[PDB]
Ligand SMILES: Cc1cn([C@H]2C[C@H](O)[C@@H](COP(=O)(O)OP(=O)(O)O)O2)c(=O)[nH]c1=O
Ligand SMILES: Cc1cn([C@H]2C[C@H](O)[C@@H](COP(=O)(O)OP(=O)(O)O)O2)c(=O)[nH]c1=O
Ligand SMILES: [Mg+2]
């Protein structure tokens with residue numbers, strides 16, 4: 175079973191992945207996890223992050239260039255994802271294809287039924303062959319709270335300074351809205367919308 | 383021995399690669415060839431070409447995004463290039479790293495001592511580990527003649543319509559100028575500047 179955890183920056187995805195993995199293991203299922211971007215394992219991922227931190231000229235100014243880099247990162251992980259799914263009962267991803275649809279649409283002020291989301295579908299699922307997730311869990315959080323979390327992280331960790339997207343409050347808001355739309359239409363597969371107070375035990379029961 | 387053939391669009395590079403390979407083989411040396419972009423073998427290469435033909439939103443509008451895609455294409459060919467060099471006496475490339483420096487600098491109206499060329503050096507040779515060529519041969523041709531060749535190709539081949547770069551006469555001119563500068567400074571290694579009337583036999587003798 176392939177599960178992807180989605181949400182804006184500072185929504186609490188990493189923590190949910192930890193809690194969910196614990197819940198699945200408590201139920202006797204083997205679990206494997208993978209997070210995108212795969213910094214260090216993909217040149218595309220590293221360049222993307224660096225661009226969001228002010229490097230690489232005009233790269234970050236292009237919505238499709240950034241989306242392409244994240245897609246190329248996932249493209250290189252197809253084998254890994256396929257291998258993990260045939261080796262573990264559950265594979266949980268911290269961000270997946272929907273992140274690209276949500277952020278790209280939001281940067282262009284488009285909705286989930288727009289051009290960017292459709293492009294992501296065509297490129298990542300059809301062309302690159304990335305498997306569609308059995309479940310996509312949207313960790314919906316107030317834009318204000320998520321932004322506060324991102325800022326707090328930068329304050330206590332010199333290695334966690336915010337990037338161009340995280341510093342854009344309006345972008346984060348629009349991204350949360352597109353995510354809600356993607357979930358409602360079942361973009362890429364079935365979705366579940368949860369809050370910061372979701373019970374890991376029952377969530378795992380719903381997914382497993 | 384690693385040799386890269388460089389020059390603007392329609393300079394006659396493909397033909398020179400053929401003639402040069404023939405000359406080397408006539409001298410008893412084994413020869414292998416590779417052309418960049420590696421269309422069909424790299425998702426990055428294909429997306430780059432498609433972007434230059436009007437697809438993928440705002441991707442082509444970013445100079446660094448395009449350069450990154452071509453660099454990612456070559457990155458995936460490192461093993462191949464290394465394998466070919468230890469298996470053949472001569473390895474000839476139709477375009478290599480210098481193409482990225484020349485076109486990127488030209489799109490930004492920079493010279494060979496500019497920011498873009500230095501970025502290409504840092505990213506492709508140092509970071510990605512691409513081997514520096516023993517020789518880089520610049521097939522210098524009049525901007526007018528090269529442009530005429532590109533146009534003629536599109537006229538007789540429906541599968542060879544010109545792209546965004548080829549349609550930009552001024553860009554092609556500036557690119558030729560940056561190439562001349564790169565050769566004069568020995569950017570990335572030793573260069574040889576030849577014309578359309580260069581003798582394949584003697585050129586091979588100089589290189590081999
Ligand atoms: C994985 C992914 C991330 N992004 C965005 C969301 C984030 O702002 C940013 C990087 O992802 P994120 O997981 O936030 O990484 P970091 O720890 O570096 O903050 O890029 C996309 O636009 N598309 C994608 O496919
Ligand atoms: C290989 C390469 C090409 N280019 C440019 C030169 C050409 O205009 C274009 C594509 O290369 P080209 O060899 O002309 O391919 P095609 O047969 O599709 O015309 O992109 C770069 O800017 N950087 C690179 O590294
Ligand atoms: Mg982030």
Ligand SMILES: [Mg+2]
Nearest residue numbers: 391392545548
């Ligand atoms: Mg061309």
